[PDB]
A paper describes a structure:
CD47, also known as integrin-associated protein, is a ubiquitously expressed 50 kDa cell surface transmembrane Ig superfamily member. CD47 interacts with integrins (for example, αvβ3, αIIbβ3, and α2β1), thrombospondin-1, and serves as a ligand for signal regulatory protein alpha (SIRPα).1 Due to its multiple interaction partners, CD47 mediates a variety of biological processes, including leukocyte adhesion and migration, T-cell activation, apoptosis and phagocytosis. Studies with erythrocytes, platelets and leukocytes identified the CD47-SIRPα interaction as a negative regulator of phagocytosis. Therefore, therapeutic targeting of CD47 may have widespread application in numerous cancers, as overexpression of CD47 may allow cancer cells to co-opt CD47-SIRPα signaling and evade phagocytosis-mediated elimination.
The mAbs were evaluated in terms of SIRPα-blocking activity, binding affinity to human and cynomolgus monkey (cyno) CD47, epitope binning groups, and hemagglutination activity. The commercially available anti-CD47 mAb B6H12.2 (CD47-SIRPα blocking; ATCC) was engineered with the human IgG2σ Fc and used for comparison in the above assays. The detailed atomic interactions of C47B161, C47B222 and B6H12.2 with the human CD47 extracellular domain were determined using crystal structures of Fab/CD47 complexes. The B6H12.2 epitope has a larger overlapping area with the SIRPα site than the other two epitopes (regions of overlap marked in red). Specifically, the CD47 regions of overlap for each antibody are: C47B161: residues Q1, N27, E29, E97, and L101-E104; C47B222: residues E35, Y37, K39, D46, T49, T99, L101 and T102; B6H12.2: residues E29, Q31, T34, E35, Y37, K39, D46, E97 and T99-E104. In ADCC assays that utilized PBMCs and HL60 target cells, similar average maximal lysis of HL60 cells was observed in response to IgG1 C47B157 (40.7%), C47B161 (42%), C47B222 (37.3%) and B6H12.2 (38.4%), with half maximal effective concentration values (EC50) of 0.0085 μg/ml, 0.0067 μg/ml, 0.0068 μg/ml and 0.0478 μg/ml, respectively. CDC activity was observed for effector function competent IgG1 B6H12.2 with an average EC50 of 0.2 μg/ml, whereas no CDC activity was observed for IgG1 C47B157, C47B161, and C47B222. Differences in CDC activity between IgG1 B6H12.2 and C47B157, C47B161 and C47B222 may be due to differences in mAb off-rate and the epitope recognized by the mAbs.
Numbering used by the authors:
A (entry chain H): 1 to 132, 139 to 220
B (entry chain C): 1 to 115
C (entry chain L): 1 to 213
Write the structure that this text describes.
């Protein structure tokens, strides 16, 4: 199976530099053009770079021309995007894609997140949303920066009835997110419920057990 | 924009070995045919396509003999070859469209029957 | 500077409908136009290339048509799992540009929200801020009004809402509203109430608690 895995996204300050990477497998890497596409928080997609299968020719829109560099190592099946002189408008999810004629992109990676900001990273505080035939409980993941956080329940064993909501930007500049799960009311006090919060930009993981209030 | 060694028109007789309509891109930059798409048009209809990603050519029934030599494509040679019996009823303007990853171009050739 | 226009931005349709999505190009691009779908929390995937060529592994209900400047993606007998955003992309013209996307929503029967209220944790109250959370779970339509009352006094300007994308199975939405108070203001009142207005409720529904109960 064709598989593309981006890495290298991080929080970076304006004017800084960042090198994104994409590992490719499941196809003859050296036989295909490759591209990078970014998706801004408004959810619009923008093509930013394409490279031919031998690496010789590179193409960029005017918005990034002169400060993005795409490259590839066909012995290593790896695609790169170097971003220089970063601006706040470069904040986006960055996807690598296999490309065909007309830049039809028939396989995409999962994306890597880049945030351009002079603000410092901050890990979240995690508070219980304690349950009061169906009950609801959850975790409030408050005051972190930047996006994203990932939230799982019982280390991924609990998936049914879980809703993790879009984060909201507060007036302080930090993000706040809620994740809730609906469970049988008969499970409260007997079943253990733990929300696992991962905030890679601050290198913080938090697990919080959520119990009925005493 | 892809640029061409243009030709206004070519002529053929029934003494011609085969019918070749020239299409030569002078600034081709593709490095594998997966990056390339070739379309040949006649009187508004697509009469030959080569999809390089899929290694797949498509022709209508009145152009069943049309082909390009794929080994020559990355040299910029997208010339269409067809039998005389397919050509003799289809004289006129042909359009050659070549598309790469980010660049493309087209050129027009008139095929004429002379003796 | 080619411009790709997708209109409308949002399209609500009925399961079983034959749906058509529009894409318009600011210039002629013949049949060099591609279609992608991006489901929520996924990356885009190629549905159709060059206006009408189907991609291996794509459901056969997707097809495309059009040439020149106007293009259509067809979904014959749309399904609830087709909810998402659909993007066109030019294959000619520079740069390779994406349309703004059309978000496909599935219409279903009205489902009233299940409403839950959560008081702030004792732990958060220590640090000077109180967050009261109200959850509206698995409802349809998406339109829903949540009003906060504190000792039966309407609150304004101190709440934020967040809505999930439409679920691909039951075609419902979920919504959370968070009321943010200072700890000092929170300790001055007893009744915290979340009042929900929605089409599925014959009367606005209020969930409340008393601080310290
Ligand atoms: C333009 O790009 C195309 C592809 O887009 C190139 O054509 C490919 O060339 C590569 C490299 O020569 C071929 O890769 C080799 O594939 C062999 C198997 O492929 C066949 O069998 C599989 C089933 O497993 C089918 O799915 C497939 O359709 C084929 O029928 C392998 O046996 C080879 O393995 C060897 O090399 C690897 C390292 O890469 C070692 O790890 C192995 O041990 C072994 O030594 C190899 O993987 C590929 O098959 C070709 N694809 C097609 C579709 O033909 C063109 O060469 C390129 N044009 C240029 C560069 O001008
Ligand atoms: C389009 O199809 C052609 C075939 O019509 C593909 O070219 C062929 O690629 C295969 C596999 O790489 C070659 O077969 C193998 O070649 C090696 C190298 O000598 C040999 O050791 C193996 O035993 C086997 O013969 C084949 O030679 C080659 N043919 C030609 C004419 O180049 C081409 O890769 C395809 N392009 C695509 C799908 O983009
Ligand atoms: C039919 O045959 C004639 C004669 O071979 C071809 O004319 C030649 O075309 C080549 C390629 O363009 C030129 O290099 C020669 O100079 C041409 N010769 C003459 C005498 O003009 C013609 O191209 C063929 N027609 C088709 C449709 O293939
Ligand atoms: C275009 O014409 C020039 C001059 O005859 C020639 O040198 C060149 O090889 C041609 N290019 C192609 C792709 O045929
Ligand atoms: C071929 O095209 C040119 C313009 O591109 C035109 O002048 C000529 O008449 C055409 N030949 C026909 C229509 O037979």
């Amino acid at each position: 199976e064709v598989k593309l895995v981006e890495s290298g996204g991080d929080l970076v300050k304006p004017g800084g530099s960042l090198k994104l990477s994409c590992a490719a497998s499941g196809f003859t890497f050296s036989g295909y053009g490759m591209s990078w596409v970014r998706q801004t928080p408004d959810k619009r997609l923008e093509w930013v770079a394409t490279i031919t299968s031998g690496g010789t020719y590179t193409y960029y829109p005017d918005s990034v021309k002169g400060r993005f560099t795409i490259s590839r190592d066909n012995a290593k099946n790896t695609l790169y995007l170097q971003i220089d002189s970063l601006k706040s408008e470069d904040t986006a999810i960055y996807f690598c894609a296999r490309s065909l004629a007309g830049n039809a992109m028939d396989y995409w990676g999962q994306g890597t997140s880049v945030t351009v900001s002079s603000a410092s990273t901050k890990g979240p505080s995690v508070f219980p949303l304690a349950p009061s035939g169906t009950a609801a409980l959850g975790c409030l993941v408050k005051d972190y920066f930047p996006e994203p956080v990932t939230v799982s329940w019982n280390s991924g064993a609990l998936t049914s009835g879980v809703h993790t909501f879009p984060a909201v930007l507060q007036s302080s500049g930090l993000y706040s997110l809620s994740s809730v799960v609906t469970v049988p009311s008969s499970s409260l006090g007997t079943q253990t419920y733990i929300c696992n919060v991962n905030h890679k930009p601050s290198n913080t993981k938090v697990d919080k057990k959520v119990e009925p209030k005493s | 924009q892809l640029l061409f060694n243009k030709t206004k028109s070519v002529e053929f007789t029934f003494g011609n070995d085969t019918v070749v309509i020239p299409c030569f891109v002078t600034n081709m930059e593709a490095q594998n045919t997966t990056e390339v798409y070739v379309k040949w048009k006649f009187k508004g209809r697509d009469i030959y396509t080569f999809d390089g990603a899929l290694n797949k050519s498509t022709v209508p029934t009145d152009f069943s003999s049309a082909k390009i030599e794929v080994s020559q494509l990355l040299k910029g040679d997208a010339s269409l070859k067809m039998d005389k019996s397919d050509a003799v009823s289809h004289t006129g303007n042909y359009t050659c469209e070549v598309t790469e990853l980010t660049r493309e171009g087209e050129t027009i050739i008139e095929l004429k029957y002379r003796v | 500077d080619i411009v790709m226009t997708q209109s409308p931005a949002t399209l609500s349709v009925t399961p079983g409908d034959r749906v058509s999505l529009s894409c318009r190009a600011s210039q002629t691009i013949s049949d060099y136009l591609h279609w992608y779908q991006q489901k929520s929390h996924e990356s885009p995937r190629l549905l159709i290339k060059f206006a009408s060529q189907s991609i291996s592994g794509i459901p056969s209900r997707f097809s495309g048509s059009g040439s020149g400047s106007d293009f259509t993606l067809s979904i014959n007998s749309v399904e609830p799992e087709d909810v998402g955003v659909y993007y066109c992309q030019n294959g000619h013209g520079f740069p390779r540009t994406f349309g703004g996307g059309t978000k496909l929503e599935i219409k279903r029967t009205v489902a009233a929200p299940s409403v839950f209220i959560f008081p702030p944790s004792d732990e958060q109250l220590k640090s000077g801020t109180a967050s009261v959370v109200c959850l509206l779970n698995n409802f349809y339509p998406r339109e829903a009004k949540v009003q906060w009352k504190v000792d039966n006094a309407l609150q304004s300007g101190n709440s934020q809402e967040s809505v999930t994308e439409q679920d691909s199975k039951d075609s419902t939405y979920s919504l959370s509203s968070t009321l943010t108070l200072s700890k000092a203001d929170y300790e001055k009142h007893k009744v915290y109430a979340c009042e929900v207005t929605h089409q599925g409720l014959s009367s606005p529904v209020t969930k409340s608690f008393n601080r310290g109960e």
